[PDB]
Amino acid sequence: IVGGYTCGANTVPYQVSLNSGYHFCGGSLINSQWVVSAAHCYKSGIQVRLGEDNINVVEGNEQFISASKSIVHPSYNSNTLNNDIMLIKLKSAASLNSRVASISLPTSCASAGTQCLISGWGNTKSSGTSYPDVLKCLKAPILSDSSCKSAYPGQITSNMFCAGYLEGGKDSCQGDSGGPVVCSGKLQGIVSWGSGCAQKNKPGVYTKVCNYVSWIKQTIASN
Numbered sequence: 449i450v451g452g453y454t455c456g457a458n459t460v461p462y463q464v465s466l467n468s469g470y471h472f473c474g475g476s477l478i479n480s481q482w483v484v485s486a487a488h489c490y491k492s493g494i495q496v497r498l499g500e501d502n503i504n505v506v507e508g509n510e511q512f513i514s515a516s517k518s519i520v521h522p523s524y525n526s527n528t529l530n531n532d533i534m535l536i537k538l539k540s541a542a543s544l545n546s547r548v549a550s551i552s553l554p555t556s557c558a559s560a561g562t563q564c565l566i567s568g569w570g571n572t573k574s575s576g577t578s579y580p581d582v583l584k585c586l587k588a589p590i591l592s593d594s595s596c597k598s599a600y601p602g603q604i605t606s607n608m609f610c611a612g613y614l615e616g617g618k619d620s621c622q623g624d625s626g627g628p629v630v631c632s633g634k635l636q637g638i639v640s641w642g643s644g645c646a647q648k649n650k651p652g653v654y655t656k657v658c659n660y661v662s663w664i665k666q667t668i669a670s671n
């Protein structure tokens with residue numbers, strides 16, 4: 449997250465860190481058994497880390513649970529990043545509490561102009577590199593589909609939206625991938641892609657979760 453703020457420990461209780469020896473992506477806890485992330489975050493060997501603030505220090509509220517199954521969307525295209533969503537089932541259920549909690553799925557899509565909260569452990573610099581140890585947060589608006597297309601001609605599908613600031617300076621970044629965009633208490637987006645981070649006229653691009661609710665629910669029901 450570039451241009452954001454320190455969230456505070458456990459103030460984003462649905463935020464997960466995906467670990468394969470090191471943090472590599474975010475995710476969102478949607479019930480005790482299941483996490484939603486980006487398909488481009490797929491790997492074998494995922495350990496889901498819940499209750500994290502400092503990802504490098506045990507602080508006492510963590511739950512470390514191996515993934516049993518990873519389900520990449522059937523129509524995921526890694527060249528176009530269309531359908532950039534994956535479900536991860538936990539080998540055992542999380543213990544839900546005030547610091548480890550699920551985020552509701554949307555019953556309709558959110559509109560342009562809606563403020564959302566985007567969070568993660570990704571890079572905090574637009575030119576440089578610098579990876580934080582504690583969770584970072586950014587409040588940002590959903591952009592118009594027309595502004596999004598104009599920013600990334602030929603690239604924005606019906607399963608994508610933009611959020612952030614056309615001026616630059618405030619965006620998600622590398623290492624935030626797979627994490628949440630929450631608006632009015634519902635998971636509306638997954639950190640998916642962009643051109644660099646926090647560049648002018650290059651806002652973040654997010655998977656449009658509302659298009660996937662039926663697939664999420666049916667897949668959880670059957671797995």
Ligand SMILES: [Br-]
Pocket residue numbers: 452453454
């Ligand atoms: Br801060």
Ligand SMILES: [Br-]
Pocket residue numbers: 478479480550
């Ligand atoms: Br739940």
Ligand SMILES: [Br-]
Pocket residue numbers: 506507508
């Ligand atoms: Br401790």
Ligand SMILES: [Br-]
Pocket residue numbers: 512513514539540
């Ligand atoms: Br486990």
Ligand SMILES: [Br-]
Pocket residue numbers: 516517537539671
């Ligand atoms: Br299973």
Ligand SMILES: [Br-]
Pocket residue numbers: 522523
């Ligand atoms: Br397909």
Ligand SMILES: [Br-]
Pocket residue numbers: 526527
């Ligand atoms: Br590819």
Ligand SMILES: [Br-]
Pocket residue numbers: 525527528
């Ligand atoms: Br292709």
Ligand SMILES: [Br-]
Pocket residue numbers: 539540541
């Ligand atoms: Br269990």
Ligand SMILES: [Br-]
Pocket residue numbers: 543544545
């Ligand atoms: Br507990």
Ligand SMILES: [Br-]
Pocket residue numbers: 545546547548
């Ligand atoms: Br607690």
Ligand SMILES: [Br-]
Pocket residue numbers: 553665
């Ligand atoms: Br639901």
Ligand SMILES: [Br-]
Pocket residue numbers: 553554555556557634
């Ligand atoms: Br909703």
Ligand SMILES: [Br-]
Pocket residue numbers: 555556557658
């Ligand atoms: Br809708």
Ligand SMILES: [Br-]
Pocket residue numbers: 563564565587
């Ligand atoms: Br917000």
Ligand SMILES: [Br-]
Pocket residue numbers: 451452453572
């Ligand atoms: Br910062």
